[PDB]
Design a protein around this ligand. Structure first.
Ligand SMILES: O=C(O)[C@@](O)(COP(=O)(O)O)[C@H](O)[C@H](O)COP(=O)(O)O
Ligand SMILES: O=C(O)[C@@](O)(COP(=O)(O)O)[C@H](O)[C@H](O)COP(=O)(O)O
Lengths: 83, 83
């Protein structure tokens, strides 16, 4: 039962050599599966980029996700729906 | 100085044989011009189609635009920002 909000913690644990499966976190998006997949893809790619830039993921996950939703609506709707 | 909110009034006054120019209503979108041009395009087609459906425009413009924004992310931002 993972969604966009769990992306920063997941990247902290598993690094880059792992699979993240969003069963209900993709199809549960308020605008279908295409938006849900884009939201998760944007969330992961944004958190990884910040980690590669030296930011502290565990502490700045919320800020990274907000900054990415600031330019991606699909992630914005995903976050405001869950958690 | 016309934005998405004025589309129900513009379509009612002018009909379908006219040009609508969104100069500052396209580039003033909180996410650029390509996002702004989509919100203007979706708003017009939603109002025009709902007029071909027989629904009243001058009274149900707000509702029509809200149903359009429910599935268009670009239109939702434009309606939130202006008015
Ligand atoms: O069957 C399910 O629920 C899932 O498809 C999750 O889909 P959602 O993402 O929609 O919950 C997973 O296969 C199980 O959770 C496996 O968990 P484990 O890896 O512990 O076996
Ligand atoms: O200069 C401007 O304001 C515009 O570029 C509109 O920009 P916005 O769309 O940002 O207002 C138009 O040329 C004038 O409004 C013309 O108005 P008229 O058609 O009455 O000459």
């Amino acid at each position: 039962g993972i969604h966009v909000w769990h992306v920063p913690d997941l990247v902290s644990i598993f690094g880059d050599d792992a699979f993240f499966l969003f069963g209900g976190g993709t199809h549960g998006h308020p605008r279908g599966s295409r938006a849900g997949a884009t939201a998760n893809r944007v969330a992961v790619e944004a958190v990884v980029q910040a980690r590669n830039e030296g930011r502290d993921i565990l502490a700045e996950g919320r800020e990274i996700l907000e900054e990415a939703a600031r330019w991606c609506p699909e992630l914005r709707e995903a976050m405001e729906l869950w958690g």
